[PDB]
Write an enzyme that holds these catalytic residues in place. Structure first.
Site, PDB file in Angstrom:
ATOM      1  N   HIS A  89       0.881  -1.151   0.000  1.00 10.36           N
ATOM      2  CA  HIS A  89       0.000   0.000   0.000  1.00 10.36           C
ATOM      3  C   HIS A  89       0.919   1.201   0.000  1.00 10.36           C
ATOM      4  CE1 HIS A  89      -3.787  -2.107   1.803  1.00 10.36           C
ATOM      5  NE2 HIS A  89      -3.682  -2.258   0.495  1.00 10.36           N
TER       6      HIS A  89
ATOM      7  N   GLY B 113      -3.592  -2.051  -7.651  1.00  3.80           N
ATOM      8  CA  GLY B 113      -4.515  -2.749  -6.773  1.00  3.80           C
ATOM      9  C   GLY B 113      -5.972  -2.321  -6.857  1.00  3.80           C
TER      10      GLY B 113
ATOM     11  N   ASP C  70      -5.122  -6.642  -7.185  1.00  5.20           N
ATOM     12  CA  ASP C  70      -5.167  -7.582  -6.081  1.00  5.20           C
ATOM     13  C   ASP C  70      -5.901  -8.855  -6.474  1.00  5.20           C
ATOM     14  OD1 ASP C  70      -5.738  -4.905  -3.696  1.00  5.20           O
ATOM     15  OD2 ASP C  70      -3.874  -5.697  -4.507  1.00  5.20           O
TER      16      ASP C  70
ATOM     17  N   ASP D  91      -1.325  -1.431   4.653  1.00  8.77           N
ATOM     18  CA  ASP D  91      -1.310  -0.385   5.670  1.00  8.77           C
ATOM     19  C   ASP D  91      -2.335  -0.610   6.780  1.00  8.77           C
ATOM     20  OD1 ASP D  91      -1.096   1.928   7.119  1.00  8.77           O
ATOM     21  OD2 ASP D  91      -1.099   3.248   5.351  1.00  8.77           O
TER      22      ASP D  91
ATOM     23  N   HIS E 276     -10.382  -0.100  -1.382  1.00  5.47           N
ATOM     24  CA  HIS E 276     -10.469  -1.480  -1.832  1.00  5.47           C
ATOM     25  C   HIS E 276     -10.151  -2.471  -0.719  1.00  5.47           C
ATOM     26  CE1 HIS E 276      -6.412  -0.079  -2.206  1.00  5.47           C
ATOM     27  NE2 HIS E 276      -5.928  -1.228  -2.643  1.00  5.47           N
TER      28      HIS E 276
ATOM     29  N   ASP F 237     -10.953  -6.126  -1.371  1.00  3.12           N
ATOM     30  CA  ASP F 237      -9.971  -6.783  -2.230  1.00  3.12           C
ATOM     31  C   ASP F 237      -8.785  -7.257  -1.377  1.00  3.12           C
ATOM     32  OD1 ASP F 237     -11.580  -4.787  -3.691  1.00  3.12           O
ATOM     33  OD2 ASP F 237     -10.436  -5.392  -5.454  1.00  3.12           O
TER      34      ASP F 237
ATOM     35  N   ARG G 281      -7.315 -13.852   2.240  1.00  2.00           N
ATOM     36  CA  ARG G 281      -8.121 -15.033   2.508  1.00  2.00           C
ATOM     37  C   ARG G 281      -7.704 -16.157   1.562  1.00  2.00           C
ATOM     38  NH1 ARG G 281     -12.320 -18.018   0.884  1.00  2.00           N
ATOM     39  NH2 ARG G 281     -12.240 -16.910  -1.125  1.00  2.00           N
TER      40      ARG G 281
END
Lengths: 151, 152, 151, 152, 152, 152
Positions: free
Chosen positions: D19, D66, D71, D91, D98, D101, D107
């Site tokens: 980020h 991203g 992403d 961050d 997002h 995302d 995950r």
């Protein structure tokens, strides 16, 4: 932000909302304070409201079930100044599909500065406050000034 | 879950909502389709609604600003069957404080099965559809049966 | 944000995604509109895609199941300009473990400005629209200019 | 959940994502370990990738930014078995539009069992570990069996 | 943001947390590395910790169950510099009611720059890293300077 | 889930937390109620606590700043039965990076059944309530029984 004031009437418009696993909790609480609650105006989401009136014989203005829009109906009323107190026993140990509605409702109750109880302890403290049946001045955001600024 | 039907009137009740960064987009879209929009009933959140009427002279039933409760007012109307179409240009590139309200509104529009547009392409496709100016039947959850089951 | 344009082809690349409780709903919708869908290119997440082709005999490019990455595969295709229409019947009355994937997919479809339907009513309105079978331009963010700016 | 195995190659396919407020941190980390990273295959999101190659001269396969889909492109690669290591310096002190995302990517990396570092300490421990430079077998969900069960 | 350093002791304070569907995997992982884990200090959330000690006879400082506050107890320890490594096998295929607690814990572990593993592959890479048994310096935010700035 | 009871002491342990835009509101509230707050034990997150004591001369046990772990420290205390009242003025009109910590804290306060105020109106009603200075019995989840069931 610009703030102004509004007066909560002596007779309060109370919204009663409870998630399924917290319904018995609210029922007991309501029955326990029925004498006092009967002095005010009650609103509730679909299932909650029907269970209450069916059990206490109290008159409850039932809205739609929470998942079907009831939470947003209550939220709308709060933002319009038509609800003065929110007793929302939401389930902190179960995931609900309408979680965004739950958070949105609590967000609005916080923004419009009305007394909110999310558990029995807080509900008891609020209803036992000396000024529960008095008119009280609360600070609320000055919407007219707020909108005028956006335009 | 039992389903029933409801009829969207020929004259639709349209809710127009736009996040700040998407307001110019909505404005332009409204202006280019003004002739058609003028034949229906318009509703909008606070700022959006005022900007629209001030710019097009069209009559818009303005509710509260979104962050102050406007999104939930629209959501309530949708669930009560008073809104037939939702044009919600939300900002996918900026975090908004009332994100739960945003998600809750889109969730209700999905549940009540009404036409929803979240971008210009979808808005254009919907407004150009033949049955936009017709009475259309939509499947909606049967609330009475649903509630009756919860109170069993 | 500078915009540019892209042309959706006459024969659209359609992604069909449905959460479990909404699968029968999508199935019926697909069958009812088979004659028309037969004229386009279909893509779907794992389970959904297999159920469709197995029931309609239509050819569906199946990706991974949503929870296993299928939603992000579709999202990637959308951002690459390979998907033109997204029919995503997500369940608004059930909490899904891959909720972030769901929201991320809807966020990208919004960003890339492609027709998206999250319920039957919207799906019907879109598929019955005149330019559904035509090539048509859509405005999209100008990525080259966007990236050039970040550097 | 029937499990199976996959082998991470000796020469790893590494995704580098950061980020904005964490970009300088990733840059320094990459430069500090350039000699080792130069031996593997690097992938990155749009801005991150370009900054890295422009600064280290290393060859990076840059995807989209991203917020624009990068992403999910990385997530898709991970699920297809084309990415073996993910260094994602997100961050934790700033809200990003997002966010879904971001959570979805993490995950998937968790589901597919590949080494993931979200901070420098974890990145250093991973890159200094034996099997970072060798081929190693990891367990992953057996998708074929998983799908076969859903269509039964 | 000002950064300073802290030294992870040779003997690490390890937090072990696992969601129900991931408990067996953590158990196996722990047993498989018992000889090494026996050299460090173990902490765990309620159920996880009790299962571990009951199965390995290892001494584990058990906190409250995650849903009852255990995740925040661990998070607090991390921010106080009392936890050096976090092995958190959260379930990426099931929705948990205390999801905010989960995300909050991972956010803090990221902020405080301690080694974190959310899957077996990452856990193995970390525990096999040479310096897992050495004292190692990590960069952490300089809180004193940070607070001094907020009260300036 | 079985319940049991706990007694809030006459002398309450109060946690005071406020997001930046809500800090002045909390300050004023504290000052106007100083005479009463002086009889209890005060805790607060980093910045909030320091501003309060610096302005009222009252003694406040300050924890870490919220974003750095303070919210989880408070949450841990609540779950351990060491905090009896939470006054949390969070900002409903601004997105905070540590939103999960915020939601997690409010979730725990709800679970452990302690009086919680998220706005001035509720804070006023609670502090003016008769039993704010009396020992009061609250129903709390029976953790021992709860854990015993998970370990069965």
């Amino acid at each position: 932000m610009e703030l102004t004031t509004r007066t909560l009437p002596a007779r309060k418009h109370i919204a009663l909302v409870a998630h399924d696993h917290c319904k018995q909790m609210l029922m007991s609480w309501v029955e326990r304070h029925q004498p006092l609650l009967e002095q005010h105006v009650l609103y509730a989401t679909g299932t909650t409201g029907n269970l209450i009136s069916r059990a206490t014989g109290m008159n409850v203005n039932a809205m739609l079930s929470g998942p079907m829009g009831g939470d947003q109906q209550v939220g709308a009323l709060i933002s319009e100044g038509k609800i003065d107190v929110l007793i929302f026993f939401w389930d902190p140990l179960n995931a609900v599909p309408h979680d965004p509605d739950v958070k949105a409702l609590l967000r609005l109750a916080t923004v419009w500065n009305i007394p909110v109880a999310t558990n029995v302890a807080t509900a008891d403290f609020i209803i036992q406050s000396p000024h529960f049946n008095d008119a009280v001045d609360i600070l609320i955001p000055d919407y007219q000034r707020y909108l005028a600024d956006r335009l």
